[PDB]
Design a protein around this ligand. Sequence first.
Ligand SMILES: [Mg+2]
Ligand SMILES: [Zn+2]
Lengths: 52, 158, 93, 71, 40, 263, 79, 1091, 105
Amino acid sequence: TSVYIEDVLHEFSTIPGVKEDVVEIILNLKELVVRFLNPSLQTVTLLLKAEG
Amino acid sequence: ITIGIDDAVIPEEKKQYLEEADRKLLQIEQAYEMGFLTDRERYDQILQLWTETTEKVTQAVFKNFEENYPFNPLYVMAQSGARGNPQQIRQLCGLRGLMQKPSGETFEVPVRSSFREGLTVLEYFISSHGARKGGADTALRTADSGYLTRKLVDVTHE
Amino acid sequence: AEPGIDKLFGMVDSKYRLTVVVAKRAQQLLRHGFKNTVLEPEERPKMQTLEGLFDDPNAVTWAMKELLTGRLVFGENLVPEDRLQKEMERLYP
Amino acid sequence: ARQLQQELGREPTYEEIAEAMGPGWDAKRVEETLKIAQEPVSLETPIGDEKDSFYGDFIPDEHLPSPVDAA
Amino acid sequence: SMARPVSIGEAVGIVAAQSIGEPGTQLTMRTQGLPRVIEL
Amino acid sequence: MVQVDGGRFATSDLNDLYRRLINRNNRLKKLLAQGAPEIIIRNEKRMLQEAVDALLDNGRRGAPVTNPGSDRPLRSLTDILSGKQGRFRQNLLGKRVDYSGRSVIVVGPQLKLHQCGLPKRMALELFKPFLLKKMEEKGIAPNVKAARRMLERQRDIKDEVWDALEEVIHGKVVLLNRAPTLHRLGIQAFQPVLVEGQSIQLHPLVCEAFNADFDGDQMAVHVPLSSFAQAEARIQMLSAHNLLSPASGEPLAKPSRDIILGL
Amino acid sequence: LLMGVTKSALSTKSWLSAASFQNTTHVLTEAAIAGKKDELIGLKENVILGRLIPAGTGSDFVRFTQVVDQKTLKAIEEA
Amino acid sequence: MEIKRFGRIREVIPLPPLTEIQVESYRRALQADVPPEKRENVGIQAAFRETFPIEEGLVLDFLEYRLGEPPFPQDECREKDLTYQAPLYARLQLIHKDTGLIKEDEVFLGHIPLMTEDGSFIINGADRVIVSQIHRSPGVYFTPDPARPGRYIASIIPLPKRGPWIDLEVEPNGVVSMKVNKRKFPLVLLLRVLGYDQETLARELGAYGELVQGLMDESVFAMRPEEALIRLFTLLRPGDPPKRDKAVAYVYGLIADPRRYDLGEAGRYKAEEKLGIRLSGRTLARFEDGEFKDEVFLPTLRYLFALTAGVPGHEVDDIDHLGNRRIRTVGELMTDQFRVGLARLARGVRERMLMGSEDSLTPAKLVNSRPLEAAIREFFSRSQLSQFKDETNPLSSLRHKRRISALGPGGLTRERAGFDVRDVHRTHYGRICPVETPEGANIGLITSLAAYARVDELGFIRTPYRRVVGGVVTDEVVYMTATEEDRYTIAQANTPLEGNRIAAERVVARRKGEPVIVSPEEVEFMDVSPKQVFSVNTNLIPFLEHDDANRALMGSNMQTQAVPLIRAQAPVVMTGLEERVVRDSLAALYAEEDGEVAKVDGNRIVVRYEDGRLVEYPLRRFYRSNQGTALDQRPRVVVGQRVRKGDLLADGPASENGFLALGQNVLVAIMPFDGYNFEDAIVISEELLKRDFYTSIHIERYEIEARDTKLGPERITRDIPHLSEAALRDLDEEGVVRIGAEVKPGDILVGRTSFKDVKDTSLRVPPGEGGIVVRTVRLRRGDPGVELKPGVREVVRVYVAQKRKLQVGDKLANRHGNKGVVAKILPVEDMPHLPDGTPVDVILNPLGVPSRMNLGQILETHLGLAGYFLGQRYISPIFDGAKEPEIKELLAQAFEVYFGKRKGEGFGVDKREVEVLRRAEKLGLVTPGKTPEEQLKELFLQGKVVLYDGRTGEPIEGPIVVGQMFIMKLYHMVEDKMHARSTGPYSLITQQPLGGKAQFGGQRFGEMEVWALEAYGAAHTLQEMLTLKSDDIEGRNAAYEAIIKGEDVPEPSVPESFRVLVKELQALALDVQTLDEKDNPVDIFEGLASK
Amino acid sequence: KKEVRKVRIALASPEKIRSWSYGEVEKPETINYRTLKPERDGLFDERIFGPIKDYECACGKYKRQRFEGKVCERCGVEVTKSIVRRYRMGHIELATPAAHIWFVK
DNA sequence: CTGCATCCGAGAGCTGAGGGAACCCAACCAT
DNA sequence: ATGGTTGGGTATAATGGGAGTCGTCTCGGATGCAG
Ligand SMILES: [Mg+2]
Ligand SMILES: [Zn+2]
């Protein structure tokens, strides 16, 4: 439901050192399937940190 | 209700109707090479023969539709009055027919292909004349009719 | 279509006369806050919202209903306008 | 301005013209002088391909009070 | 439009002019066609 | 002679025509006061006559008068009066009106014959004063000015305002019109049902009367204001009350296209 | 006589409709010379003047109709 | 996915560069890279060599010209609203015949705009295209007399604005008459002027009968040439003093002066070919040694007599023949405007030479270049042929660049066009597309150049043909004009061949456009390809031979309005031209040479070529086009990848892997659906919205100005009084919204205060707009290259972006002319679905097919079903492509896969399928006595499948056509059109509501509507609308007050427009007076105009 | 307020035109280039056609209502509604008579 | 004094949305 | 008290301008011909 990326101000921007624009990153992330092992869990925040 | 390419059934009689025409054509040419006919008479005879062939093809198409495929989508659409007229159905199945030059006179060779079989370049180009003339006719007619309506409203308004 | 439009059209010799009568009756109802109506409390036009049924604010519907009921008299040169308005105010302030 | 443009080969700036006029002339006065030399345009300037849209048809009244303001 | 005698006050001139003019656009094609109507 | 928003000036051609007339008149007076020879006076009188002619009817005798640097003839008072763009045909027999809107049309198969689907935003903008008065009746706003400021910004609108709007339009009708209007049926009255989205929903059975399809056609909406207008729209212009053609007497609102196919 | 629709329309008595139709300068100069008076009989003149057209609800046959209930009518009868 | 291609016709030559019609023309007109010593006499060079020498004394002579480099690059010109142009310098020398001294000086003449690589111009920061104009070719023509049969009229026509048309006609009397400048007079006078004796005329024209008898007139012949000049002058210019030199100058200027009359290269060529004679120059006659010498008049009279007398070998001219109509391209129009400007410059030079002090004068002071620059600006900013370039997608620009227009300056008029100027002539074959043209009032007047056509140096359209020798088709290609084409028999391109020998006893051919059947021996030329008959847009419609011409027209026109999509795909069925279209539009990026990719980024690609040189290509990202669509380039390469020459590096807008991608391939079913697809409406599934199909990016520009005012300068600042902090949250300390902030209608973008002690005058988002602010640009006074209008200190621009998804009210279209508005968006569970559970995406009404006769979409759907189940794409060229048997075989394979998949899992035939098979058996679609699998295979080979209804689970009672279809979203979106108004601004004079959504205007109630209101008898509605809602100021104020107070609106009054009418009628010295029933004056102005 | 029933159109005499006009326009000036105010005896002069602002003379002596019908002595501008600027005409006195082209052509 | 008979000039041709070139010289009035 | 404005003067001799448009149809006066 939500994405935050460092040093990007809107969906219509690009990230230095990254081939894909932010729109394509959102499109790819919309295909992610996440399983919650705990029934009471309502929301989670996954963190990703990578360097080329 | 659906439309497929095979639903535009082309009657078998059409083939015969074409061959018969190809027969009379030869006769006509003979009657022109031996002096019995002039250019004008031969031109008229070709037009008459192709017109009668087109009408006969229309009749054969609709008789086939009624006798073999009574629930055909195009036939049902035409007979119920929902959409379509017999001329369009004939163009779809039998043949388009004679076409008019920009000068207003008919061509000597007709369009013997339907829209299901697929047209060649030459028939498409000759039909472009009639298509363009109809479009321009519409374009002028709408303005002239608007002017007439304004004049009538102004003369009868009281 | 509006209910009973056929009868309303057959009640008058001209449809524009019916329209004029409906508009004038609607104006009369609007001016006095629906206190001059001839409808019984169970013939009153209702409107259903979440809170509950209330009176219909549209005066034209009221005029059509009263014209359908047949308790209104209409015609040409019935009463002087000044006297009409004064009497109207007398019965329904 | 036209002589400066011809010699220098491009449209001159206001400061160059002011410098070439002499004492008592700065760029600000030159802008004002060009500003006051402007001529009114026509309200019927044709806009678009068809001959039906005029410039003055897009000019609103800012003087008379609006119906909301009067109420 | 009502299959009943016309009401007094109807603007029949405008209705007649519109009724005549309506088909002419597109319905009538083009001595013959719309030019004949215009000439008449 | 007005100042445009950009600070520039815009003027009418009548000012230039009057200026030319005044210049020639003043020069004629000066020349007459000087005892000039008759050739100069004759030329001056000819030019004054030509200037008067240009003011009254420019472009009638000789070459029309134009403004320097352009080939456009100046529009005289007669030019203002006459023509397709003249006063009579453009501002007297037809006007632009308030309480009106326009939008694309979409098929409305679930509507009744007397109903049309109107977007919520169009209804809110069209019935704004009625909505303000009705909100005043309720407790949504203390006064009309507060209601106006609240309705001004889109994000400042709440839920009960929509119910107030639904109560406002109860029983009222609007006029739908598709250009070109070839017959009287090109304008018809409908009861608005509030819908979501941006498209007006039209009943399938009136498409033949409007000569409207759904390949990009747009239609305009108008709101009759007074009691007389509403009565006329509801009694004489209701769609369900106009079922036969005024030209032939045959039915004009009738099943077509898919309905015949199914039946 | 028989004249086309254009010439019949341009020959009407009302100078307002004729002036708003066509040939505005000729109609206006003839009307000004003759001192013509427009009686506002047709619909276009009333539309131009922003008046109520003499048709429909604006017809003299129907636009003077009054409406009243029985109680008020009886009260006026007693008065 | 594998691509399989059909077709038998092999093309000897590829398509020419698709934008050459602009680029080559401009290059030939400029000749920038040709050294001055070798420059030809075309373009602006010819204008320079014609206007100069400016003879007076003194003589100013032209030596050469040069073009410098632009002061600013293209992108810098785009941002600062400048014109991309180059300075033009001309070196001249002033000589003094009496003295001898020569002053040589290079003078700056102004700036000439430069066309970019793609073929467009940047004028004042805006992209513009010059459209080519089709017009009547100059020369000599002969036409039949319309009034009286058996006589003919000869016409001599120069270039536009380069001389008068000259008419020759044999009068009923029997004498010949020449009309020029609308002045009939006998031609024998002019013949005598040119120096013709009776013996010469009698010997030259005697054989032709009594015309030569009627031509001689002894009164005229007895007169000497000079006296004939005086007589001609008094006939042509009655009243003007008949001086000898003045008459000489007038007659010289009329027909013999090169600076006023000029028959072009086309006119000269046409005259030489028609009359069989040789011209010396470009004029009708020559003035040498005080004597006029004839050049064209005698040949013209000879041809006229021969044609009238029925001598064989002389024919009339068809004025719509494409050999008699020519094309003026951008270069020719620019050169003509340059010539006019140069003539004005010549006038200025002559005046300054006369008035200037002859002792101290140089070429620089004599030449004022202002008129030339003014003329160029006028041409490039106000000419009707210069049009705001359409860049919705690359195909839009490519189409616009190939457009041919009959309108424009000197062209035809839309209201006076008949039928001869709008019909497709027989000579259009291979030169002008007969299908693609506008549908409204411009039909037949605006057209497109054919795909293989090339405009030659003379302005005549040429088309290519293969040479056939002895029944053998060769590889030699000859480009021919229509006149040349008329002399041969040209065989159709679809004639069967074995190797390169015509393997057919009867060949279909054209003879002067007439279809004929000939033997292979008589064929002289052959068509190159069917593609050459139609334009580029029409070449992108598969199965074009199955479509009616009107719907092909609609599809061709409507493909231009396609919006780029963020997930665009190439069509399942292509014609094989999408790669050339994308390549020639300069939208994608290709590797210049063989090399290896070094760096890849979202805004940069650095490539290492085999030369060892690193080359960096920046990428245009999220840039606003002229139409608001977003055009961006996305890299399609990875670091370390080896790229050959011409390999794709970055994808352009509306392109997928180098193929044109204008829309999406969706699963469609052809069936009615609950009336939601009634009358062309379209029903779509929510699954399209879920996976971001038909989602587009749009950019809007908002501009504001801070200027100087008498009460003080305007200023952009954060501190504006009487606004809460909630409306100033997103503004920075400089009064501009921060990048990335979301804005809704009513939010402030740029803050501004004006001296009222200040008041709010900020720029806000109009109703119905908004989005995310993506860019801000500030231009201030003094910044290099900035040219603001006087008085304005600075300008602020804001670029705001929107992500628009498909919604109800949006327009969708296919390539076959089927267009429709989305009427309903259904949940996935309501959509009809296949027995394997896959739902369809789009439902199309079958009623659109039978009357529109666009059957190509049905064949496309069948091929799309086959490709969907086989996982491949197909190339089907127009008029030579997929036929029914091939599609049936492909469908057989697709059914084998589609059914073996189900049968492997262990499932038989459903009961519902059995019921549907029974129903189809009753319908006669399948043969009774076969197994259910065989019947299902027969239905699949007919393109029909069993389909289930999502609401009930019962099957549709008959088999339904289902398959993949290519559908594109159109630029007509309801978001940009929805508008409503209660009250707002009013006009200055009429006091009536303004028009347009931008002005928050109201809809116009025209005459047609008022008539309907009258026909309903709704007098009160009309009276309210005409006063209380338009221009009754007191009436509308009182109405608003009464409505907001709960009462009813009052009675109306006289509208203000009638007061304006009365005031304007009194200004014409006409007394208009309103009177009551008793003939007394009624003052409608409330005593405000009575002294 | 009587109802309007007929509209009459007729030729206008010079006396009628002079009675319509509130003054003769003697100069071709339109507006001042410095103050953007109408020039005296020009095509926009407030003494002839009326004030630009409601109930306020040109020189500012009177800026309040109740002065209806009062003409300021310094500036000569009547104090009234500004709307009178769309009703009040002026006139130009020709040195020599000129023919009305409508009755000539 | 009729009647023909061209001969010339005047005035029209759908709606709606959207369209963007002298210098000096010296007195004189407003504020 | 101050600038910006308003009108007047300049002395070899100087003496009839200059731009130009063409693919429409229909209607009603106007002029010139035979009877
Ligand atoms: Mg449409
Ligand atoms: Zn004062």
